[PDB]
Amino acid sequence: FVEMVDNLRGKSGQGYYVEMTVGSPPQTLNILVDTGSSNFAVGAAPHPFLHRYYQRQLSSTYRDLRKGVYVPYTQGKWEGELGTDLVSIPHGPNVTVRANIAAITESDKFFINGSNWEGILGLAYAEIARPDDSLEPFFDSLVKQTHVPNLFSLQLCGLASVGGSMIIGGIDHSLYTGSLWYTPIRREWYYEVIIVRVEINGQDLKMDCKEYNYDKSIVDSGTTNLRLPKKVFEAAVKSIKAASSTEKFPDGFWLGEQLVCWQAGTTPWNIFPVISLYLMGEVTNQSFRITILPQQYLRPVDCYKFAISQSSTGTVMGAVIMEGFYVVFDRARKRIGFAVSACHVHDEFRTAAVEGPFVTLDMEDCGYNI
Ligand SMILES: Cc1cccnc1-c1ccc2nc(N)c(C[C@@H](C)C(=O)NCCC(C)(C)C)cc2c1
Numbered sequence: 001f002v003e004m005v006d007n008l009r010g011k012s013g014q015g016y017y018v019e020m021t022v023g024s025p026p027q028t029l030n031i032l033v034d035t036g037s038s039n040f041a042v043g044a045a046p047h048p049f050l051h052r053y054y055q056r057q058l059s060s061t062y063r064d065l066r067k068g069v070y071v072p073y074t075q076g077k078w079e080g081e082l083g084t085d086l087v088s089i090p091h092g093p094n095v096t097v098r099a100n101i102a103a104i105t106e107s108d109k110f111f112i113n114g115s116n117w118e119g120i121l122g123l124a125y126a127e128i129a130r131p132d133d134s135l136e137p138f139f140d141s142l143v144k145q146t147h148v149p150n151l152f153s154l155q156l157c158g159l160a161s162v163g164g165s166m167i168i169g170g171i172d173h174s175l176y177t178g179s180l181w182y183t184p185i186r187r188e189w190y191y192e193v194i195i196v197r198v199e200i201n202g203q204d205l206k207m208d209c210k211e212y213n214y215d216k217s218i219v220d221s222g223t224t225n226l227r228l229p230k231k232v233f234e235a236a237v238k239s240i241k242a243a244s245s246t247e248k249f250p251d252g253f254w255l256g257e258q259l260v261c262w263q264a265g266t267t268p269w270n271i272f273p274v275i276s277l278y279l280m281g282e283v284t285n286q287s288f289r290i291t292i293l294p295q296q297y298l299r300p301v302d303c304y305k306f307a308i309s310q311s312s313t314g315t316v317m318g319a320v321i322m323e324g325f326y327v328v329f330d331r332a333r334k335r336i337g338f339a340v341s342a343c344h345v346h347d348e349f350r351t352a353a354v355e356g357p358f359v360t361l362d363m364e365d366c367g368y369n370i
Pocket residue numbers: 034035036037038071072073075076077078108109110120128220221222223313316
């Protein structure tokens with residue numbers, strides 16, 4: 001899938017985007033790739049932050065659905081007008097599909113001042129689409145209307161410019177080393193998975209595994225951090241604090257309130273521990289583990305920011321996790337594959353890893369239910 005390698009760009013902390021076209025004639029836009037939402041939404045008005053925007057008056061293939069959509073968030077909103085139009089991905093498969101598009105006509109704290117993207121591509125499932133699950137997401141339209149296989153994969157390589165690959169309809173085996181290991185998609189809404197054990201430098205946190213997935217755990221290209229449920233975060237920080245105690249840092253650093261700096265090329269990587277998440281495997285009583293380095297969770301802003309944070313919406317495996325691995329969203333088989341990424345950032349002593357099989361009992365008890 002050589003045509004698709006290196007089709008993602010971004011700025012550190014501003015997300016990864018892919019080039020798309022909308023309308024006839026085609027209008028080029030940069031679009032955030034977001035596996036934690038399910039709407040395709042593009043700027044359609046001259047917001048001063050935007051390089052460009054969708055001009056529906058210029059598209060002969062635009063169809064109005066005569067319906068509004070309002071999407072609030074914890075901080076901010078976007079609102080817009082629903083339609084369909086022809087959509088393509090220049091460095092993607094050689095197809096064009098009629099997709100739902102939310103034309104964003106009012107927003108708050110959505111667009112980023114200085115960013116180079118103008119819309120968002122929600123790759124998750126219809127259940128979490130707005131206004132409701134009747135609004136077919138882009139990828140569902142792509143699969144229904146073409147012969148593109150029902151899978152995509154992401155290699156996110158971690159303002160400094162970032163890059164990566166979104167392989168639509170397949171897997172590029174050059175982007176990873178070792179084998180892929182698969183964890184089930186527990187339910188098709190977010191890309192929900194189940195974490196069954198957590199270790200800091202090989203030391204088990206020893207929490208009830210239900211805590212790790214309270215109230216869900218998800219794989220999310222739209223989130224920068226590794227977000228953890230509050231109880232798990234405090235246990236995790238307590239352990240990471242202890243593991244790196246040969247140097248002391250202000251309390252505020254662990255809470256993301258401040259940076260920590262060293263002289264150029266003398267960051268003490270080795271004093272910081274690795275973080276392992278064991279995921280539910282394909283077989284009964286079988287798990288595997290993925291392991292990340294401080295190079296993943298200490299993010300440059302040589303000064304760095306702590307990129308693990310507490311959450312009330314569950315564990316969110318964002319870029320901190322994803323930049324370690326090639327991640328396969330195998331929708332056809334309701335599973336997510338992880339392999340060591342050929343592009344991940346590491347040092348001479350440690351590398352990110354994916355290892356198995358391990359024996360883990362009572363994994364079904366780790367999932368949260370109402
Ligand atoms: C909708 C919105 C308005 C203003 C600012 N941000 C957003 C927004 C857009 C896409 C997002 N995509 C994400 N993956 C996330 C994190 C994720 C765990 C999450 O909360 N997903 C639900 C996203 C939503 C369905 C658009 C509300 C947050 C998002 C927030």
